[PDB]
Write a protein that binds this ligand. Structure first.
Ligand SMILES: O=P([O-])([O-])O
Length: 372
C-alpha cells in the first residue's frame, strides 16, 4: 500500500513537484487544511477522495495548527495503538493579496487600508490611496476550513485595531470579523477555486498562497495584479511585494522549538501574532509583513515496516542537509527552513535513540497506524 497524504492547497504544487515526495508516496491530494486534519485524525480517506474508503490516510499537509481539542482527542483515542502524532513546519510562506482591477498605477495597500478592505469599511477602489482606480471592491474568500485563512486572520487579528469590530483567528473567514463579511463578498473553494472566482467579475481582491497568486514568480512583483503591502504616505514609504525574498529574513529569525517542550506537537509550529506577546513571533517591521508556516502531520509509528521506512526516507530528504527539496521549495514561492531548523527536526524525528523518532523500535514496538 502506497503512503497517502493530502490536505492544504496552499503548498500542493510543491508536494506535486516530481521527486519532492519519495518512494512509496502516492501523489498529494489538495482538499484544504481542515479536510487534511480530519483525514489524518480519523483515518478517513473520504476527506481526500469523496466516495473512496479502501485506503488509509498516512499524513496530511496543513497551514492550520492542530487545536487543543484535536490533539487531546487523538491522544486519548488513537495514540495508545497508533503512537504519537508528529506536527512539524514544512516551509515558510508569505500571504499574497492578488486582485483583478486593471491599470498601470501600482496598488500598494497600507496595513490600515488592508484592514478596511477586509472589514468592508473601504469598499471602493477610490478609497485606496494612489490606486489610479475607481469603482466597487468585491472581496473573495475561502468557503471552507482553510489554513490560508488561519495565516491571514492571524495578521488581521494582530494589526486591525481600528475597525467597528474585531477579526478572530479562524480557518473560516466567513466568521472572522465580528461585524460580518463585506456586502457582496464571494465565497469559493480551494486556492484555485478562489483564483478562478477572482477573474469572474471586475474589481475583486483576495488573500492567497504566493504560488497561486501569480502564474509566474515575477508576477508577485507586478503591483497591477498583486498588491504591495506596507505603504505609509506620511513617511513617504512604499510597501513591497509578497515575493519569498521579502519574507525570508523574517522566517530565518524564527527560533527553533523549545527543547523541553518538544514532546508537545503544538510547540513545533511557530505562529506570528500581536506585538510584545510571548509565545508568538511579532510580524516583521521590514520586508513584507504577512507570513507564516505551512506544516506536515505524520505518525511516529506505522504497523507496517516498509511504510515506516518510506516515511523516514521522506523526512531524510525534506529535512536533509544535502539532496533535499529546497530548490523545489523556492520554485513554488516558498522559503526553505534554516539549516539549524532542519537539524532540530532530524534530531527529534529521525535520530533513532530519540524517544520521538519515527519507527523507534522500543516506543513503536508493536504499535502504529494500521496496514489494512
Ligand atoms: O487550502 P489551505 O492551504 O488550507 O488554505
Amino acid at each position: 500500500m502506497d503512503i497517502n497524504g493530502g490536505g492544504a492547497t496552499l503548498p500542493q504544487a510543491l508536494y506535486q513537484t516530481s521527486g519532492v515526495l519519495t518512494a512509496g508516496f502516492a501523489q498529494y491530494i489538495g482538499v484544504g487544511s481542515g479536510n487534511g486534519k480530519a483525514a489524518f485524525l480519523n483515518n478517513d480517506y473520504t476527506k481526500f477522495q469523496a466516495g473512496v474508503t479502501n485506503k488509509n490516510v498516512h499524513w496530511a499537509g496543513s497551514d492550520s495548527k492542530l487545536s487543543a481539542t484535536e490533539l487531546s482527542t487523538y491522544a486519548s483515542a488513537k495514540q495508545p495503538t497508533w503512537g504519537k502524532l508528529i506536527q512539524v513546519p514544512s516551509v515558510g510562506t508569505s500571504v499574497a493579496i492578488p486582485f483583478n482591477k486593471s491599470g498601470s498605477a501600482a496598488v500598494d495597500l497600507s496595513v490600515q487600508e488592508l484592514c478596511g478592505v477586509f472589514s468592508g469599511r473601504i469598499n471602493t477602489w477610490d478609497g485606496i490611496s494612489g490606486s489610479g482606480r475607481t469603482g466597487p471592491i468585491v472581496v473573495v474568500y475561502r468557503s471552507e476550513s482553510s489554513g490560508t485563512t488561519e495565516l491571514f486572520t492571524r495578521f488581521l487579528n494582530a494589526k486591525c485595531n481600528a475597525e467597528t469590530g474585531n477579526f478572530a483567528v479562524t480557518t473560516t473567514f466567513g466568521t472572522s470579523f465580528s461585524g460580518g463579511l463585506p456586502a457582496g463578498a464571494v465565497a469559493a473553494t480551494g486556492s484555485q477555486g478562489v483564483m478562478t472566482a477572482l477573474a469572474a467579475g471586475d474589481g475583486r481582491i483576495t488573500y492567497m498562497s504566493p504560488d497561486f497568486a501569480a502564474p509566474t514568480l515575477a508576477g508577485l512583483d507586478d503591483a497591477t495584479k498583486v498588491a504591495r503591502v506596507g505603504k505609509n504616505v506620511a513617511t513617504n514609504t512604499q510597501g513591497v511585494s509578497p515575493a519569498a525574498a521579502n519574507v525570508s529574513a523574517a522566517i530565518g529569525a524564527v527560533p527553533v522549538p523549545a527543547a523541553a517542550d518538544r514532546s508537545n506537537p503544538d510547540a513545533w509550529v511557530p505562529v506570528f501574532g500581536p506585538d510584545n506577546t510571548a509565545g508568538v513571533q511579532p510580524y516583521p517591521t521590514s520586508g513584507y509583513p504577512i507570513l507564516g508556516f505551512t506544516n506536515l502531520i505524520f505518525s511516529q509509528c506505522y504497523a507496517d515496516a516498509t511504510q515506516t521506512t518510506q516515511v523516514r526516507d521522506f523526512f531524510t530528504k525534506h529535512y536533509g542537509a544535502s539532496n533535499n527539496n529546497d530548490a523545489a521549495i523556492t520554485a513554488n514561492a516558498f522559503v526553505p527552513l534554516p539549516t539549524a531548523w532542519k537539524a532540530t527536526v532530524r534530531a527529534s524525528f529521525l535520530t533513532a535513540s530519540n524517544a520521538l523518532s519515527i519507527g523507534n523500535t522500543n516506543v513503536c514496538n508493536g504499535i502504529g497506524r494500521p496496514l489494512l
